[PDB]
């Protein structure tokens, strides 16, 4: 039932200045009114960040995603190393009731999607391992920080109602941990 | 002739600690002493000899020191199946095996 | 001079005469750096 | 009437006797600390 | 937050651990000229020396009569030696087997013999045993490597291979690296033997139970040791590393015959005598070297560097910086956004970035060094 | 190894005799080895009796000099013990073992239990 | 796990972090992810059960 | 810097190039504490 | 963990067609199954019961 569309989804790759993002705390340890130094994985200050308007993008060390979402256009996410059944593969869907995070060995289509008129993104479902459930995300900004330090996958969360026109705003926001995962995976592609 | 007065003989010490086996002679056997390991119901097995030279197959936790009428066989870490009689035997003259320390659990 | 500084004795002759020289060297070194750091402490306090 | 120290007893330290007690094995292990007691004795002769 | 790897204003924040840096000069870090065009230099001589025939030799000598050899003027490829699993034991104590491929020595010594399988642990620094104390003694600083591999099918005979002999009793110990051939009687008591027969008089010739049916932990393992030296002669026994071309008066990194260092090479008016191999000046820093092939004198100073300092007048007053590099003529710097720009100034204490000299005179505030000082 | 194999029957009646044998595998008798025996009496422990040389020379302990005579078989590759008048105090595990002062290699031993 | 005791100085192992001292009532407001605290100079001073 | 401090070599560049860092590090540590105690001694007399 | 749904399941398969179930990421209090007499043989080999 899955066929690939013909025209390529060649998003325009613009460049602008970031001015802020990547400002957060590392773990779940409180401090009070003190300045603490850390070596961590960061988008450096005042850097050159790319504008996107579904091809595979490179791994990086750490990917920062933001979406200036309006009424939930972006729907799902595909992550993995080989993205097949020989090794575990990550799938993220913010469906109507929850957010679902799985690290499981699906057999995906070339363009797996919700099949609007959820789980039709796999051709086969064998030996699937991890499941995670949390609250629904939903003129909004949804922020992810993908980090992998010392065999630990840290995924922070932040939700913001956003209204700016083009670039990343002049403001500050920390991102709080929702899930920590002690999983050793060498993810190479995502979607 | 040179007689062998043992000291360890029998002892009840717990696991992994130090075991002393003092063999005292009448005259000087300064280089002449051997040190065997005999499980009860088995054959003796030589641990050290010839001024602290260890037998092939014997570990290095066993050490020897002393000369003359003060000698020792030391176990740095005791085991349950180390329950054995550990004889000293000199070879300065007609030899004589010591009393043998039956190291007990 | 009558403290071990983490070694096993406060007289050097006993270090020589109790156990084998190869591994006694580190204990000698331990007593040496104990007595030296004490001496350097003593030199320092004397300098102060 | 006020009382105030103005010197101390002039003291010097044999490095190798105090740290070894006249042992060749101790001093041989002690030499690999390099220029180790020349500066102590220089400080103490400087103290002297 | 603050990026501590970005601009010099932000790096001053990161060191002082505050967001409010007061006006002045702070120490940020040290800088260095990173080396490029890596140079590596060996002598001309490039023939192989057969360590393989010594490694793969069928008959060895005894444990107390080990055969000793000196090898010079070759290249030895430790890579083909490293990956091989034919040796049951391959352990290097004072060195790592993977890094031998870079360094070049001379006067390598190898002693070989045959021993039982359980005693292959006995050949090691700081080990006591029968052959560790009565047949071959090892120093505490015994840098090198050792090799053992099983030879039960060959060095054991069905009649009992008693040709591998060793001494059982002796009056005293043996010094490390000495060989004895005198097969003499042992006095085990108070009667002087004079080498004939009888009690307290034993023959040190005694045998092993070598048989081909015997399994692991008692099989005849052939054991070869590898001993090296450090810096006594112009090095001849090299490793599998090739050479390149040498460049002068640029900060490079160099491997001169196993001597690794960094710096700027130039032409030296000093006078090496022909017996000299290299140079040093004070406290084991190689100050001049004659190269191993063209045999011409160069001299080494490690390439010029210092600390980096930031002149920032306070984060409330402004955000623009100046950067001091401590004690470099500011030509050998290869921050490429700043280094190419409006003005770059050079001090007797190094060089200044982002600042222009003025003819003025002021009661100055932020000191630079060498009598010059900086301000916003 | 110098494996020393003891062989034969073991149960004997009181006031009987033991004719014991120690077969040698893995060592030449034509050497400096003193082919000896060690018994294990309760109270005395192990006790050195004596050994033989391949030419015939012998050296014993004075407690068991008067009863022990031993002989050698070089091509048969063994060495033996002869105990005359085996007493109840000879209730001991007798270990044949190769000796050059020390006893580096042993036989496993046969206890004499008279019954 | 056992019950915790206050205002008598005991050994405590709050969620795997082990420390000694006396426990008092505190007025500070932790954020919903911060489990335990540390005030200054890298020393524990406040813990939430 | 020309004292071994009980290590196997007195130049750190040899230590990195001669062994693996899991075993080089203890030799570097003896060199570090050797140079550091000497540096602290040098700093202490220089502080004096 | 639903070990009750494993130990008190309504139907089990045959031995040569054995049911495979994956159990992960929960808490199992083994005291209630230890004190239950509903198991005829309970022989532990990995660690003691």
H abuts C (3+ Cβ pairs < 8 Å): yes
Given a contact as 3+ CB pairs under 8 Å, which chains touch A?
Answer: E, G, I
Cβ–Cβ below 8 Å for A44 and E18 = no
The gap from C-alpha E47 to its chain's centroid, in whole angstroms, comes to 23
Please report residues of E whose CB lies closer than 8 A to that of F59. Answer: 199
Cβ–Cβ below 8 Å for C35 and D13 = no
| Resolution to 1 decimal place, in Å | 3.6
Centre a 10 Å sphere on the Cβ of residue F83 and count the other Cβ atoms it contains: 21
Which residue of A28, A30, A34 is the best one to mutate when testing the G interface, meaning the one whose CB has the most G CBs within 10 A?
A: A30
According to DSSP, the residues that pair with F25 across neighbouring strands are: F3
Which residues of E152-191 form beta strands (DSSP E)? 186-187
Residues 6+ apart with CB under 8 A from A102: A90, A91, A128, A130, A131, A132
Helix (H, G, I), strand (E, B) or coil at D34: coil
Which residue of F98, F102, F113 is the best one to mutate when testing the B interface, meaning the one whose CB has the most B CBs within 10 A?
A: F102
Q: Using CB atoms within 10 Å of the CB of residue E114, give its burial: 0 to 12 exposed, 13 to 18 middle, 19+ buried.
A: buried
| Whether B91 contacts chain E with CB within 8 A | yes
CA distance A98 to A75: 12
Please report residues of A whose CB lies closer than 8 A to that of E19. Answer: 35
Cβ–Cβ below 8 Å for A35 and E18 = yes
CA distance E159 to F25: 10
Q: How many CA atoms lie within 13 A of A149 on its CB side?
A: 13
Q: How many CA atoms lie within 13 A of E26 on its CB side?
A: 20
Please report residues of F whose CB lies closer than 8 A to that of E199. Answer: 59
The DSSP-derived string for B70-105 is: -EEEEESS--GGG-EEE-EEE-SSS-EE---EEEE-
- Encoding tokens for residue A158? 């932040």
CA distance E7 to E323: 10
Residues 6+ apart with CB under 8 A from A25: A174
The gap from C-alpha B82 to its chain's centroid, in whole angstroms, comes to 13
Contact between D16 and D41 (Cβ < 8 Å): no
Which H/E stretch holds residue C25? helix C21-47
| Whether D31 contacts chain C with CB within 8 A | no
CA distance H9 to F66: 66
Strands B10-12 and B101-104: parallel
Residues 6+ apart with CB under 8 A from E73: E45, E47, E49, E236, E237
CA distance G15 to G34: 13
Residues of E with CB under 8 A from a CB of F: 160, 162, 168-169, 188, 197-200, 202-203, 205-207, 209, 211, 214, 218
Q: Using CB atoms within 10 Å of the CB of residue E368, give its burial: 0 to 12 exposed, 13 to 18 middle, 19+ buried.
A: buried
Considering only the beta carbons, identify the residue of E10, E18, E19 that sits closest to A45.
E10
Residues of F with CB under 8 A from a CB of B: 38, 40, 44-48, 59-62, 95, 97, 101-104, 106-109
| Whether D11 contacts chain H with CB within 8 A | no
| Whether F77 contacts chain E with CB within 8 A | no
Which residue of B lies nearest to E171 if distances are taken between CA atoms? B31
């Amino acid at each position: 039932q899955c066929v690939n569309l013909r025209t390529r989804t060649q998003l325009p790759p613009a460049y602008t200045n970031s001015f802020t993002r990547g400002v957060y705390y590392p773990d779940k340890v409180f401090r009070s009114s003190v300045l603490h130094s850390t070596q961590d994985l960061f988008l450096p200050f005042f850097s050159n960040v790319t504008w996107f308007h579904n091809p595979v993008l490179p791994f990086n060390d750490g990917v920062y995603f933001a979406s200036t979402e309006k009424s939930n256009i972006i729907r799902g996410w595909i992550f993995g190393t080989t993205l097949d059944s020989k090794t575990q593969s990550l799938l993220i869907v913010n469906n109507a009731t929850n957010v679902v995070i799985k690290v499981c060995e699906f057999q995906f289509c070339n363009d797996p999607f919700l099949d609007v008129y959820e789980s039709g993104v796999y051709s086969s479902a064998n030996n699937c391992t991890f499941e995670y459930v949390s609250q629904p995300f939903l003129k909004n900004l949804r922020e992810f920080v993908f980090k992998n330090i010392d065999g630990y996958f840290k995924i922070y969360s932040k939700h913001t109602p956003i209204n700016l026109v083009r670039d990343l705003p002049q403001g500050f926001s920390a991102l709080e941990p929702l899930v920590d995962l002690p999983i050793g995976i060498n993810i190479t592609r995502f979607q | 002739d040179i007689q062998l007065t043992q000291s360890p003989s029998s002892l009840s010490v717990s696991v992994g600690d130090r075991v002393t086996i003092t063999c005292r002679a009448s005259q000087a056997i300064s280089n002449s002493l051997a040190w065997y390991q005999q499980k009860p119901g088995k054959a003796p097995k030589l641990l050290l000899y010839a001024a602290s030279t260890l037998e092939s197959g014997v570990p290095s936790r066993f050490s020897g020191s002393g000369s003359g009428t003060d000698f020792t066989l030391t176990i740095s870490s005791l085991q349950p199946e180390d329950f054995a009689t550990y004889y000293c035997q000199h070879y300065y003259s007609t030899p004589f095996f010591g009393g043998g320390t039956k190291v007990e659990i | 001079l009558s403290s071990n500084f983490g070694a096993i004795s406060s007289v050097l002759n006993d270090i020589l005469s109790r156990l084998d020289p190869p591994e006694a060297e580190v204990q000698i070194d331990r007593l040496i750096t104990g007595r030296l750091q004490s001496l350097q402490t003593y030199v320092t306090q004397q300098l102060i | 009437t006020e009382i105030l120290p103005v010197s101390m007893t002039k003291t010097s330290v044999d490095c190798t006797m105090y740290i070894c007690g006249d042992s060749t094995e101790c001093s041989n292990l002690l030499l690999q600390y390099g220029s180790f007691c020349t500066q102590l004795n220089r400080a103490l002769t400087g103290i002297a | 937050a603050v990026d501590c790897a970005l601009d010099p204003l932000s790096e001053t924040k990161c060191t002082l651990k505050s967001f409010t840096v007061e006006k002045g000069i702070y120490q940020t870090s040290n800088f260095r000229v990173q080396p490029t065009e890596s140079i590596v230099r060996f002598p001309n001589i490039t023939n192989l020396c057969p360590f393989g025939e010594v490694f793969n030799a069928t008959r060895f000598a005894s444990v107390y009569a080990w055969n000793r050899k000196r090898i010079s003027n070759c290249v030895a490829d430790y890579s083909v030696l490293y990956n091989s699993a034919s040796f049951s034991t391959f352990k290097c104590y004072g060195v790592s087997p993977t890094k031998l491929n870079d360094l070049c020595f001379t006067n390598v010594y190898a002693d070989s013999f045959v021993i039982r399988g359980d005693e292959v642990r006995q050949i090691a620094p700081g080990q006591t045993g029968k052959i560790a104390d009565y047949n071959y003694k090892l120093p505490d600083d015994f840098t090198g490597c050792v090799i053992a591999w099983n030879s039960n099918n060959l060095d054991s005979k069905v009649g009992g291979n008693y040709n591998y002999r060793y001494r059982l009793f002796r009056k005293s110990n043996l010094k490390p690296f000495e060989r004895d051939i005198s097969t003499e009687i042992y006095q085990a008591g108070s009667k002087p033997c004079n080498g004939v027969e009888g009690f307290n008089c034993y023959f040190p010739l005694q045998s092993y139970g070598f048989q081909p049916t015997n399994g692991v932990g008692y099989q005849p393992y052939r054991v070869v040791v590898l001993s090296f030296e450090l810096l006594h002669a112009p090095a001849t026994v090299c490793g599998p590393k090739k050479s390149t071309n040498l460049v002068k008066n640029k900060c490079v990194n160099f491997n001169f015959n196993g001597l690794t260092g960094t710096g700027v090479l130039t032409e030296s008016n000093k006078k090496f005598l022909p017996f000299q191999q290299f140079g040093r000046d004070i406290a084991d820093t190689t100050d001049a070297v004659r190269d191993p092939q063209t045999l011409e004198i160069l001299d080494i100073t490690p390439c010029s560097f210092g600390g980096v300092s930031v002149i920032t007048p306070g984060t409330n007053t402004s955000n623009q910086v100046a950067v001091l590099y401590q004690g470099v003529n500011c030509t050998e710097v290869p921050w490429r956004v700043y280094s190419t720009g409006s003005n770059v100034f050079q001090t007797r204490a190094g060089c200044l970035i982002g600042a222009e000299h003025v003819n003025n005179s002021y009661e100055c505030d932020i000191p630079i060094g060498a009598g010059i000082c900086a301000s916003y | 190894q110098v494996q020393l194999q003891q062989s034969g029957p073991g149960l004997v009646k009181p006031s009987g005799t033991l004719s014991l044998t120690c077969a040698v595998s893995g060592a030449s008798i034509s050497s400096g080895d003193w082919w000896s025996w060690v018994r294990q009496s309760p109270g005395r422990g192990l006790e050195w009796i004596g050994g033989i040389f391949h030419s015939g020379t012998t050296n014993y302990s004075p407690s068991l000099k008067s009863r022990v005579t031993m002989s050698v078989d070089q091509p048969k590759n063994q060495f033996s013990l002869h105990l005359t008048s085996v007493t109840a105090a000879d209730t001991a595990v007798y270990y044949c073992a190769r000796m050059r002062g020390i006893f580096d290699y042993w036989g496993q031993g046969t206890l004499v239990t008279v019954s």
